[PDB]
Amino acid sequence: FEVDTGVYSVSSAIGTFIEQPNATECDFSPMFKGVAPQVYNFKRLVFSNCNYNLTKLLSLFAVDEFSCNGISPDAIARGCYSTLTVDYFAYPLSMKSYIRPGSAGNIPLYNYKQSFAHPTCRVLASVPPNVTITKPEAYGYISKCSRLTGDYQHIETPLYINPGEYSICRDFAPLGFSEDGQVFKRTLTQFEGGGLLIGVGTRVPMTANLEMGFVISVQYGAGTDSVCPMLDLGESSTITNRLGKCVDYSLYGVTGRGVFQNCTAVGVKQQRFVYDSFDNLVGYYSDDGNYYCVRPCVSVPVSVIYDKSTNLHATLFGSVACEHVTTMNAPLQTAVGCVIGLSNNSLVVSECKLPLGQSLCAVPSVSSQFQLAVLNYTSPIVLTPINSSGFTAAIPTNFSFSVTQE
Amino acid sequence: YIETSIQKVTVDCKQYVCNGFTRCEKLLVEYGQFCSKINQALHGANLRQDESVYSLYSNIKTTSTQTLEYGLNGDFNLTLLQVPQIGGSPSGYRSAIEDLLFDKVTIADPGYMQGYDDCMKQGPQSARDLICAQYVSGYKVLPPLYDPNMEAAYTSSLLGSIAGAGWTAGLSSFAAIPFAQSMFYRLNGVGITQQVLSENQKLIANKFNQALGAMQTGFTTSNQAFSKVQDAVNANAQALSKLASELSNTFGAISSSISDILARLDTAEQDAQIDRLINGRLTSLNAFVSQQLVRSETAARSAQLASDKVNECVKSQSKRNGFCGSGTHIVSFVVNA
Amino acid sequence: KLASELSNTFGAISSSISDILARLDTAEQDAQIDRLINGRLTSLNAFVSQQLVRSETAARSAQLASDKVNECVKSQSKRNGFCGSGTHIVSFVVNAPNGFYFFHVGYVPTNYTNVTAAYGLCNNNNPPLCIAPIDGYFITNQTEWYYTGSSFFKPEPITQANSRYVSSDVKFEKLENNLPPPLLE
Amino acid sequence: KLASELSNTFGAISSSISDILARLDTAEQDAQIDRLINGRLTSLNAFV
Amino acid sequence: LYDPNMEAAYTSSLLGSIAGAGWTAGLSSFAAIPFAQSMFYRLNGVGI
Numbered sequence A: 001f002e003v004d005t006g007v008y009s010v011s012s013a014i015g016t017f018i019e020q021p022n023a024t025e026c027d028f029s030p031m032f033k034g035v036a037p038q039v040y041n042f043k044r045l046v047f048s049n050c051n052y053n054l055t056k057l058l059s060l061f062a063v064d065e066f067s068c069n070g071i072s073p074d075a076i077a078r079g080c081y082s083t084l085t086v087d088y089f090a091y092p093l094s095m096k097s098y099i100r101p102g103s104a105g106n107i108p109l110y111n112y113k114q115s116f117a118h119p120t121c122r123v124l125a126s127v128p129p130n131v132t133i134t135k136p137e138a139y140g141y142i143s144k145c146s147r148l149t150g151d152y153q154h155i156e157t158p159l160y161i162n163p164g165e166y167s168i169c170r171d172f173a174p175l176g177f178s179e180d181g182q183v184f185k186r187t188l189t190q191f192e193g194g195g196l197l198i199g200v201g202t203r204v205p206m207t208a209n210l211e212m213g214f215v216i217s218v219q220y221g222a223g224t225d226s227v228c229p230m231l232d233l234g235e236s237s238t239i240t241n242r243l244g245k246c247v248d249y250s251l252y253g254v255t256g257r258g259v260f261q262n263c264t265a266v267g268v269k270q271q272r273f274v275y276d277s278f279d280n281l282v283g284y285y286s287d288d289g290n291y292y293c294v295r296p297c298v299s300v301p302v303s304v305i306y307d308k309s310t311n312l313h314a315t316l317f318g319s320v321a322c323e324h325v326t327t328m329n330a331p332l333q334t335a336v337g338c339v340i341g342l343s344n345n346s347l348v349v350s351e352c353k354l355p356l357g358q359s360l361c362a363v364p365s366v367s368s369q370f371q372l373a374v375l376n377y378t379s380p381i382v383l384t385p386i387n388s389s390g391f392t393a394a395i396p397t398n399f400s401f402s403v404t405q406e
Numbered sequence B: 001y002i003e004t005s006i007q008k009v010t011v012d013c014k015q016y017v018c019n020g021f022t023r024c025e026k027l028l029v030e031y032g033q034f035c036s037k038i039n040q041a042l043h044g045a046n047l048r049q050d051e052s053v054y055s056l057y058s059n060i061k062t063t064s065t066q067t068l069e070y071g072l073n074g075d076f077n078l079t080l081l082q083v084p085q086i087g088g089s090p091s092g093y094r095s096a097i098e099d100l101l102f103d104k105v106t107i108a109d110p111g112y113m114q115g116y117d118d119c120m121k122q123g124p125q126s127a128r129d130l131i132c133a134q135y136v137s138g139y140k141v142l143p144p145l146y147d148p149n150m151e152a153a154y155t156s157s158l159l160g161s162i163a164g165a166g167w168t169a170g171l172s173s174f175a176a177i178p179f180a181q182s183m184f185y186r187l188n189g190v191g192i193t194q195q196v197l198s199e200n201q202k203l204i205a206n207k208f209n210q211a212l213g214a215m216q217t218g219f220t221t222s223n224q225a226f227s228k229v230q231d232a233v234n235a236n237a238q239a240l241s242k243l244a245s246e247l248s249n250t251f252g253a254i255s256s257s258i259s260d261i262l263a264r265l266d267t268a269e270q271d272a273q274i275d276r277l278i279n280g281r282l283t284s285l286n287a288f289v290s291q292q293l294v295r296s297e298t299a300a301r302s303a304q305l306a307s308d309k310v311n312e313c314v315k316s317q318s319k320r321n322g323f324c325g326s327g328t329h330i331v332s333f334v335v336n337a
Numbered sequence C: 001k002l003a004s005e006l007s008n009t010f011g012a013i014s015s016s017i018s019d020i021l022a023r024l025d026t027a028e029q030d031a032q033i034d035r036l037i038n039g040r041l042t043s044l045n046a047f048v049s050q051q052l053v054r055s056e057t058a059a060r061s062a063q064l065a066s067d068k069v070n071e072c073v074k075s076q077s078k079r080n081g082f083c084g085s086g087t088h089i090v091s092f093v094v095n096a097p098n099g100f101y102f103f104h105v106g107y108v109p110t111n112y113t114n115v116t117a118a119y120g121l122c123n124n125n126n127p128p129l130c131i132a133p134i135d136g137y138f139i140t141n142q143t144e145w146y147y148t149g150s151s152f153f154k155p156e157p158i159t160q161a162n163s164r165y166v167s168s169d170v171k172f173e174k175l176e177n178n179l180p181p182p183l184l185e
Numbered sequence D: 001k002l003a004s005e006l007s008n009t010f011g012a013i014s015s016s017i018s019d020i021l022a023r024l025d026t027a028e029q030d031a032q033i034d035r036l037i038n039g040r041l042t043s044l045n046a047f048v
Numbered sequence E: 001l002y003d004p005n006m007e008a009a010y011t012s013s014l015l016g017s018i019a020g021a022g023w024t025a026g027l028s029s030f031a032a033i034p035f036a037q038s039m040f041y042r043l044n045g046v047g048i
Ligand SMILES: *[C@@H]1O[C@H](CO)[C@@H](O)[C@H](O)[C@H]1NC(C)=O
Pocket: A053, A054, A055, A056, A230, A231
């Protein structure tokens, strides 16, 4: 409740700006036509510049596990992204542990390894009977994939896939294995290394309902187009009326906060996003044919000038012109900013307790008011050189003793 | 060059840490005994600079002075050290040689009067430049105690400063000896006889004028003293550069931006990632306060050395060796850097 | 700051090991203590580095106090502004918390007067001997040239004690008559 | 002091990057090697 | 290191070290000149 006398540095509803394209519906039809592929023969769909309807997807599948790394399903459901990559296949739920990261089985070795470069979600789900996805025959997965070599064909080199890639033993039986432990042999050509490729397949009995696995990956900053959920256009589509206002923006897959001004075009018009050396958006080629400068949102500084003896206080808006303060007593423009609570009586002081900086001062004139004052330099004694044949000199006629404490 | 002060910077702990995000601020309310300590420490460090500057300018004030001509005081030309005059001194305060010294130093204008409005309009991508990046990152640069006009008057008075004759003990008399006659006493004391052809007046002033007039060439990075002038400016900018660059450190989170964290994560786990940004950006601010305290004391202990050379070899001739320049010391001059 | 650095969570659920042990399973407890252990050592390293800067700063300031004792206190200083303000007379030192407190007594005049104060006095003779004052000024009676001290105004007769023999100059004042005792014959 | 700060776990399972590579999965390998990078950089800054 | 009693013994002995001055050329001799006389020599040097 008690603070000393000094100048103290103390500490509006951001809106929304969304430009998204008028884009065609994302097509999931390839997933629903044909026998569902096996784990080692997974199928990939890349979605860019399209819109999806979440209600259909919720109705068509029943999710059982959604282990996500880097993102959450809700974020994918309420956000717009550059690229959406889905790897889908048929995977038994009873083996749901063998596809986890860290699994010691054969699925991450020869069948499917998930990549963690980008945000990903692994979703194991089951297809309801009414949904028309042709169930395979019994599930299948590769249990061995190795290159046999040596003069006696006696040394065997296991072959392992890379994250997101396909196996080299896929071509033995792309649609499934007729019997458990089915063995295949092939001869590699000279250009491919040569030798005897050996594969083994394991057959897992089919379940009552189709169970599938999905790996969903999102890519940011990989194009000038967006994959979005279906939504209303709304009123936040335009910025031309809102220049100079801090807004949360969601533009074609890039999100942030900023203030938009109108400048001259720089950079390449195609890329639509101008960046500085530190990966911050600084320019945007809007669809309205204008290039907008993007600035970070700024805050006006405030300081408090306080006098305890007289309990007087004033506010200093450092380095801010008074025109801005009025638009967003009487404000007074000084050499260190805009001040509210000080009066200009053209006062001049020799020394004072409160410095404002740049030779300004605030002195609480008695009889209850702060007055702005200016420090004045005290000119030394200009000793006049009277004309003579010698030098005029100053010699003391009275003295005192002063103690200096250090 | 003698440094007497550092740039006074203060920080807003609730704006540097949480860039105006109300989701971040609510988690910072649990903190805020660590923000006050930063705010109170910086207030004290800036308060001590004001008391060091006030003390410095009271140790170099002059009791009495005499008046000098615009140039060619006796035969010695002091124009480089005097404010220009057409009739009488118009159009500024700083001497001619301060104009040349400041023009060769790269300084970003901090805009103490309308800095917010100028950064508001101009600088399309220059609105993260260290001066225009202070209304973004939540810090602020305070103006110095004295305006350059009064800071110039303290050094001007030193040029015409008068002292007691030259052979009288004590610091209590003032003799109005003309500047030309004063120089001859200083040369007489160091060994030059007064029969040196009337002390060769036409050939001592000329060599004094030649050496004093040729000091403009010394404002290059090859010069040691001017190199230290630029390093003092670079150090002040580097303190602000490291303050802004610590708002791009992820500290182990997914991103350095709280907007990205709130847009790619669920409510439960967002609070975990934001707290890593709050636990950082507070340790970093603890390193800033520690760094700027040591710089504030180092300057204050060099302001004492600044006042010493004003009193040892500006207000009077120095008989010391090497303290005030190579060779036997005659006279020295001080200007503002 | 040392005591207040112990109330830092460092990302843990609490800053108290009592609450960490009272809320979490044995597997997860050790993961939260190690946040308090990796912290509280970074904060101690900050203390250790900060107390080496403060200690050397005071060790260098001890030489300043030792030098200023040998100059201001044990003798009279002829430096300008080293020992207080004004010309230095005497200084006293007493102990203060964590240092030395000095009292520098100086001679400060309060009132002034203006005089003529000639440079010197040349004999009106061939091969002239010229007397300059010592530790004072040659002032007129305002002619009879007298001598006064530099720090206090008191005219006195000129003698050999307060006169120093120097070479002749044009700027000196030639004395046709009223020669001082040192300059006579 | 510069060399002795290379044996600090910084909360990781092990100080050595070789141990982190030989004991964990690819998902969690890059979450603890990153702990050693946020440290070892603050430590370098304190040296500067 | 030192208690207040011994800390102030050094400074109390500095007040009376005027005999330690020994006004001459050099610091190796001591003169037992009273305090009152020393001040008049101190004031005499500065111009009075
Ligand atoms: C999504 O599908 C549902 C199913 O009827 C429909 O009601 C809704 O309008 C669709 N959303 C669109 C078209 O944006």
